[PDB]
Amino acid sequence: SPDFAKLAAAQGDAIDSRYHPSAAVRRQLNKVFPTHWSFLLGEIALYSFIILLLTGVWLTLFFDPSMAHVTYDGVYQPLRGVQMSRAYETALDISFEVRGGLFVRQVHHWAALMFAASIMVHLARIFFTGAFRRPREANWVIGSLLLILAMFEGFFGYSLPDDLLSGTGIRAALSGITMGIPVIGTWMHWALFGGDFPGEILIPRLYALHILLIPGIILALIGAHLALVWFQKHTQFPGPGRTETNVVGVRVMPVFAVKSGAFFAMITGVLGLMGGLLTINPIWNLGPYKPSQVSAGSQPDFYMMWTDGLIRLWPAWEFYPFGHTIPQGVWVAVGMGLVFALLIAYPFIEKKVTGDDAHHNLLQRPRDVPVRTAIGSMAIALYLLLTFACMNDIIALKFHISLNATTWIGRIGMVVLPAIVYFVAYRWAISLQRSDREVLEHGVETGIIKRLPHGAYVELHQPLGPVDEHGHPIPLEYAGAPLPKRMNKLGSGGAPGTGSFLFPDPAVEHEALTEAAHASEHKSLTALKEHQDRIH
Amino acid sequence: SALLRTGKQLFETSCVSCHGANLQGVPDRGPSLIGTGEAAVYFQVSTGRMPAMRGEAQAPSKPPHFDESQIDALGAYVQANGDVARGGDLFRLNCASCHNFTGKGGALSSGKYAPDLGDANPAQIYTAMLTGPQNMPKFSDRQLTPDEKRDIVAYVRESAET
Amino acid sequence: MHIEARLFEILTAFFALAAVVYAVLTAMFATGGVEWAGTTALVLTTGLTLITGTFFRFVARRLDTRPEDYEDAEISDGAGELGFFAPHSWWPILISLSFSTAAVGAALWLPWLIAAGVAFVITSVCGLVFEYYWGPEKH
């Protein structure tokens, strides 16, 4: 008969006799992580990367990456007898002649998009809350290379099927930008193609980079990135027990081994629904990449859309300084290389500007930094403008505007719109600060009016602390608190009466589940209050 | 029937540039064919920005806008779906404002005459009437029965030839 | 609350007098038959001031003389509480944007943006309704 208690004790004595992971494990388990919703945004990019591993190891058991020409003679009826590369025929064998291969192919593209979206959402959590300061300067730099490597990993990914829609993206980007670089010339163009476009060793070179070379650097950087946040510990917003040298939150073994394991089950469950329901990349509609053909919607994915929108907005500015020429593509290769330079080296050009070079462990709330919130929201508004000018032909057809006037609202807008998002966010972040001082001077502005007996409509503010015989109470200090604005979020709503959604409980079991519920949170309140007074 | 392999390769060679089942960004795109069929998707739209694939008075040649077998094949590929005098008078009433006077409502210079319609024939007119045009509301199913469409097409054709 | 209800019972006495007269004078004197596009909107605008009008009559027949209805009441009669009034909320800005992104799509005929606009309405009408009923968090 099985026991699973004596069998689990003698296994732990066996591990602790061979090895000795007793003091080593307990410090890892007793690791305290802050519970906050924003601190799970980096786990989506960590969990979408594991899905790209598992559905990408599958997807290379069926893909043949060559460029050798072969007629189809398979199962898809429009593409019969079409001269295609073998990279495109096996990409049509995954979709059609592998049982549930279209599903794993579509999951793998949506997991590629959830990856490169939740890196951008995670950059915005790091930027505005200020998690890149003194100890974590190099964790920004290790981080911001993973964003640049995720741009090129996905761009080398959808270029593997050798679609017509996805082959003109290579002809635009890798064959137009690399051909007009003034630093060395076109000498690089024969070094990453092996000849003229398309050559013969394009896709087997983009299959090597995309499997081992770039995900061997991404996984090596992630391993040097989650092992920084593990050992220099995680930051926290200021609050009741948060005093710049604590980590107030929850431990690892009972909690956060569950809510970070169940969150991996729910990120994967979304990509199961999105990978099965929503179609992502039909490479069977537009046929193989033949250079005579044409596609009316030649657009990259949304992480590479700001690069295509940058080419469309720069005007036709060439130079001709000598007998040689300098094309329009110099303004993108120095435009892409300057965005990637002000995004890697940002925390070193705020230590120089502000001068604040002290060891910061408490995050700062993004309404309390009105300039860097306004520099940041300038950059979202400039990113959103470039990615809404790369799809201007779809804005032309569907939204009925123009195809000529969507660049002039982009090229004039590239200067005007990030100038007025700076003003409407610097004056927004300061007015959010003034809303936090009205809830401290006067209190939580509730709704109850109560006409006094001589007129005099008042609003019966809630004092949020000690009271006084004067009308407004003693004013509190700010100290980075979130400061609840509504009275239902404080203790004024109340329980709806325990029971089912249709039938109640017999009210002896109701007063026991609300006396032991208003005292189980009152025990939680005097716990931090008797810990905040121990520090101060 | 029309060969759908030829239809796919013709779509890729000549229409993929503005249409990936979507519509061309520049100006106004033709868009996805509504009620796609040989009768309307086959009938060209020379008027407007869209170029004219079929060339009138054209002998077999290597350089050509479209091929009778090529047209049918592409119209089919896009279309996956996955009293003659009495008829003319009725067309004038429904389309009396623009068709009447044989002229064009959008442009006074533009006309419904064969020179304006180039290589016109009854089938091409019937087809554009059925689903109407890029700027003209479709008439089949929605407004006019097949006899009425046939009669109005014949009246317009006889008026333009004479 | 008498002359709040009588204000809606004079209008429904006029519109019923202006829908009987309009239906009869277009029954015997119009150039064709009875005109329906105007007598519909007059039988239902004496239905506007009859759903509203008879509801104010049922309320003025149940309520006593409140301090507004008395002729010369002192100002010290409203010593109680007025009620609840939302002091500030960013939910009306996000219902107007959500209903104007289901009307751009209804104008341009984009079914992918009507159905994205209807779902933005419901997830923001949920925000305005549920705003003063949440309770704290459970952590």
Binding site: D393, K398 | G20 | -
Partner: peptide, 30 residues
């Protein structure tokens, strides 16, 4: 269009909404 643009639009309003909206239920607000 049916390529990367309505698919990229459907990422942010379906996928990342139901990946942030989950994290606001698992996580806290402080």
């Amino acid at each position: 269009g049916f390529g990367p643009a309505p698919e990229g639009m459907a990422m942010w309003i379906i996928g990342m909404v139901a990946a942030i909206g989950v994290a606001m239920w698992i996580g806290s607000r402080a």
